Amino acid sequence: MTYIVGLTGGIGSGKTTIANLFTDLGVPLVDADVVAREVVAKDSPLLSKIVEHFGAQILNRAALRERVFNHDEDKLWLNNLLHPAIRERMKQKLAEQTAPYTLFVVPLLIENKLTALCDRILVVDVSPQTQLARSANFEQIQRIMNSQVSQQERLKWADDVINNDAELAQNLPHLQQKVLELHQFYLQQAENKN
Ligand SMILES: Nc1ncnc2c1ncn2[C@@H]1O[C@H](COP(=O)(O)OP(=O)(O)OP(=O)(O)O)[C@@H](O)[C@H]1O
Ligand SMILES: [Hg+2]
């Protein structure tokens, strides 16, 4: 198996930014939001079950998200259908990779208990004030942050941490360096598996 690095981080923390520096090195990426997308694509068996349950009225993703919001009840139904499907499709894509290591980007890696799927956890860390600043509404982001794990909790889960609080203009070169150092370390971790 590819060595698998789960990348996560709270809303607005810079997961995409960091994932991009790894894909710049030619490292493959399995992205949870992309997979979640594939799973309900136009002609897909999941989609057609969603449509039977909700109506053609919905894929209009905004319409479906809208519907979920009603109460935990339809959300439960959808999660019972999609979460296991997304998980399996993730496993598939990861097992298909033949690079020495793969970056597995998952916004809810901890919260949805997908930590068993990766070898090691990379967190992009920033303060809550940074999350709010970068994500800019203030009200809406805060509720998202309330439903995600705390900074401390995310950090206790992390094997590696890259800090993204400083602005890119000044800190990008140090961010790049830290990614090159992790890159070299992950290749070594992949070799050690053999
Ligand atoms: N260190 C940086 N300095 C200034 N802006 C940054 C920095 N890092 C990322 N950003 C910007 O902050 C925003 C959030 O970054 P990014 O998309 O990488 O985070 P994310 O964790 O993937 O976001 P989300 O989960 O909320 O979609 C983007 O607008 C991005 O361009
Ligand atoms: Hg992991």
Swiss-Prot record:
Localization, UniProt: Cytoplasm
Pathway where it operates: Cofactor biosynthesis; coenzyme A biosynthesis; CoA from (R)-pantothenate: step 5/5
GO biological process, one term: coenzyme A biosynthetic process
Binding site for ATP: G12, S13, G14, K15, T16, T17
GO cellular component, one term: cytoplasm
PROSITE patterns on file: DPCK
Primary enzyme class: transferase
One Pfam family matching this protein: CoaE
Function recorded in the entry: Catalyzes the phosphorylation of the 3'-hydroxyl group of dephosphocoenzyme A to form coenzyme A.
Residues annotated as domain DPCK: 4-193
Residue ranges the record marks as coiled coil: none
Highest taxon listed in the record's lineage: Bacteria
Record keyword ATP-binding present: yes
GO MF annotation list: ATP binding; dephospho-CoA kinase activity
UniProt-recorded name of the protein: Dephospho-CoA kinase
The entry's keywords: ATP-binding, Coenzyme A biosynthesis, Cytoplasm, Kinase, Nucleotide-binding, Transferase
Listed NCBIfam families: dephospho-CoA kinase
Gene3D superfamilies: P-loop containing nucleotide triphosphate hydrolases
Family of this protein: Belongs to the CoaE family.
Organism: Haemophilus influenzae (strain ATCC 51907 / DSM 11121 / KW20 / Rd)
EC number from the UniProt entry: 2.7.1.24
Catalytic reaction annotation: 3'-dephospho-CoA + ATP = ADP + CoA + H(+)
